[PDB]
Amino acid sequence: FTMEFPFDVDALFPERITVLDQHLRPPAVDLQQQIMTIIDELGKASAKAQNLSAPITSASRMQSNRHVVYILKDSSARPAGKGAIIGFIKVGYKKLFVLDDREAHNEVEPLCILDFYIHESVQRHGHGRELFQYMLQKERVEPHQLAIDRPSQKLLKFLNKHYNLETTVPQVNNFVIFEGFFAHQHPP
Amino acid sequence: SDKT
Ligand SMILES: *SCCNC(=O)CCNC(=O)[C@H](O)C(C)(C)COP(=O)(O)OP(=O)(O)OC[C@H]1O[C@@H](n2cnc3c(N)ncnc32)[C@H](O)[C@@H]1OP(=O)(O)O
Secondary structure, three states, X not given: OOOOOOOOHHHHOOOOEEEEOOOOOOOOOOHHHHHHHHHHHHHHHXXXXXXXXXXXXXXXXXXXXXXXXXXXXXXXXOOOOOOOXXXXXXXXXXXXXXEOOOOOEEEEOOEEEXXXXXXXXXXXXXXXXXXXXXXXXXHOOOHHHOEEEOOOHHHHHHHHHHXXXXXXXXXXXOEEEEOOOOOOOOOO | XXXX
């Protein structure tokens, strides 16, 4: 993944952030395969960045799940003149049982952050925050209501810096939740 | 979790 593709990303994705589900519908010469290629390359790049041995995001996995992907294109002009992709965030609701600090196992179904990646060359340029904000607004969720699949320390620092989130009770299911997640807790 |  270099951000650029051998087709016109701006023609494919007219909007700054494009939201796709399992159907991978092109916005309105196989435009759907253009989208699938972008997702495949994004997933491979994200896995590499997270020290994972294989991708957790791909076109095929989008098609066989009920996840939603938000894709941020580059709003600047590139020298190659066909646009570019900055990164993405993938979310999905999941059933979990989470332990609180009162020894209760709570059955929940939160929106989960499942994959999140911004191209290395343009990390720490604010793109991740922009993408995350757009997702919060469309999904109608507040940050402390999220669970995150095995977050990187980079993401925990991002969430603490931008939203003051602090992790709460550690779990055995590989998801992380934050203070405010439980009904008896308060967001920061 | 898929990150396992
Ligand atoms: S759970 C998987 C999350 N993905 C990854 O870990 C993959 C590699 N990182 C990324 O794709 C992006 O760096 C993520 C984590 C998605 C954040 O996006 P941005 O880099 O675009 O974030 P912003 O510029 O909006 O915010 C910057 C703040 O984010 C935290 N942070 C970014 N990068 C790091 C690193 N390398 N180490 C520690 N923290 C990092 C910081 O709080 C950073 O604030 P700064 O002002 O740059 O300090």
